[PDB]
Amino acid sequence: KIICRDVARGYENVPIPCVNGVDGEPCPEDYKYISENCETSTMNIDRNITHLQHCTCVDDCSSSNCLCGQLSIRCWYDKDGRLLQEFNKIEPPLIFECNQACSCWRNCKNRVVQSGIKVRLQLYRTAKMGWGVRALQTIPQGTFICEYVGELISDAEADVREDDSYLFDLDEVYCIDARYYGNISRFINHLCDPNIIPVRVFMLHQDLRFPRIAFFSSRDIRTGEELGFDYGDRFWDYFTCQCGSEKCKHSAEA
Ligand SMILES: Nc1ncnc2c1ncn2[C@@H]1O[C@H](CSCC[C@H](N)C(=O)O)[C@@H](O)[C@H]1O
Ligand SMILES: [Zn+2]
Ligand SMILES: [Zn+2]
Ligand SMILES: [Zn+2]
Ligand SMILES: [Zn+2]
């Protein structure tokens, strides 16, 4: 049987199994699973602790006076760590989580992304799109899913790389390249009917060149459902969409 118990090798809060019920391809081995972003050449990230804006809260950061919440416009997390229904899912705001400069505790309410993966996912072989990721549980709208993790590289570097299949733009542009080093998010396919959205988030640094990319569910997700986001019209403008949705706008057909 083609199967891996945990492609993350214990690095995430939960296992991420792999299965293939479709064809003869073994679990992918042509990359290195990493749970946090890496660098090869240095990006010279502004890690200066004194450049962090931070809050003075000594409660759990649930009040509207939390500076970090104000930097985000408001804290968009409800009491359970889910995005509020009012969250702009078309044009998400930048999220500034609490950090090591804040007065609050590490368990405050403004630290969802930095607390890591909580939902049960599976790497699996799709019918027509290669590998994909699907839910092994129901997941309410607004739930943090996973971060787009990979190798941070410059625009000029991305421009000369052989394989652009695993690039996520941090638009002056830097990219996250998950080709050689990446997490579960490298396997998330494009869907014309998407159920997750990427959100830019700041945690341990606030170097605006380098937002981290957090996927949140955009609606309730059912068990077994493939996870997917909108790669965008510019990406689509070699191969055509196989999402198979009645709404597909990028197939060879339509
Ligand atoms: N909607 C879609 N239709 C056809 N291919 C898709 C797709 N979304 C993603 N892909 C494929 O997946 C690549 C992005 S990386 C996503 C994981 C990939 N399916 C894998 O097996 O490793 C794209 O280059 C394309 O090959
Ligand atoms: Zn606060
Ligand atoms: Zn806080
Ligand atoms: Zn704070
Ligand atoms: Zn489609």
Author numbering: 920 to 1090, 1095 to 1160, 1165 to 1181
Show the paper's wording:
Mono-, di- or tri- methylation of H3K9 constitute distinct biochemical signals and are established by distinct histone methyltransferases; G9a and GLP are mono- and di-methylases, and SUV39H2 di- and tri-methylates a mono-methylated substrate. GLP residues that contribute to substrate binding are conserved in G9a, and it is reasonable to assume that the peptide binding mode observed in GLP holds for G9a. The Post-SET domains of G9a and GLP present an α-helix that contributes to peptide binding where other HKMTs have a loop. First, a conserved tyrosine residue of the post-SET domain (Y1211 in GLP and Y1154 in G9a) is a major component of the lysine binding channel while its hydroxyl group participates in catalysis. Second, the hydroxyl group of GLP's Y1124 (Y1067 in G9a) hydrogen-bonds to the methyl-accepting nitrogen, thereby inhibiting an orientation of the dimethyl-amine that would favor transfer of a methyl from SAM, as was previously shown for SETD7 (for review). To confirm this model, we showed that, unlike wild-type G9a, the Y1067F mutant is able to tri-methylate H3K9. Similarly, it was shown that the F1152Y G9a mutant can only mono-methylate H3K9. Our structures show that this residue is perfectly superimposed with GLP's F1209 (0.1 Å RMSD), which, if mutated to Tyr, would hydrogen-bond with the ε-amine nitrogen of H3K9 and impair the alignment of the accepting amine's lone pair with the methyl-sulfur bond of SAM. Unlike I-SET, Post-SET is absent from the PRDM2 structure, which lacks co-crystallized SAM or SAH. It is partially folded in the structures of G9a and SUV39H2 in complex with SAH and SAM respectively, and fully ordered in the ternary complexes of GLP with SAH and H3K9 peptide. As previously observed with other HKMTs (for review), the co-factor contributes to the formation of a hydrophobic, mostly aromatic cluster (composed of Post-SET Y1211/Y1154/Y261, F1215/F1158, W1216/W1159/L298, F1223/F1166/T285 and SET H1170/H1113/H220 in GLP/G9a/SUV39H2) necessary for partial folding of the Post-SET domain.
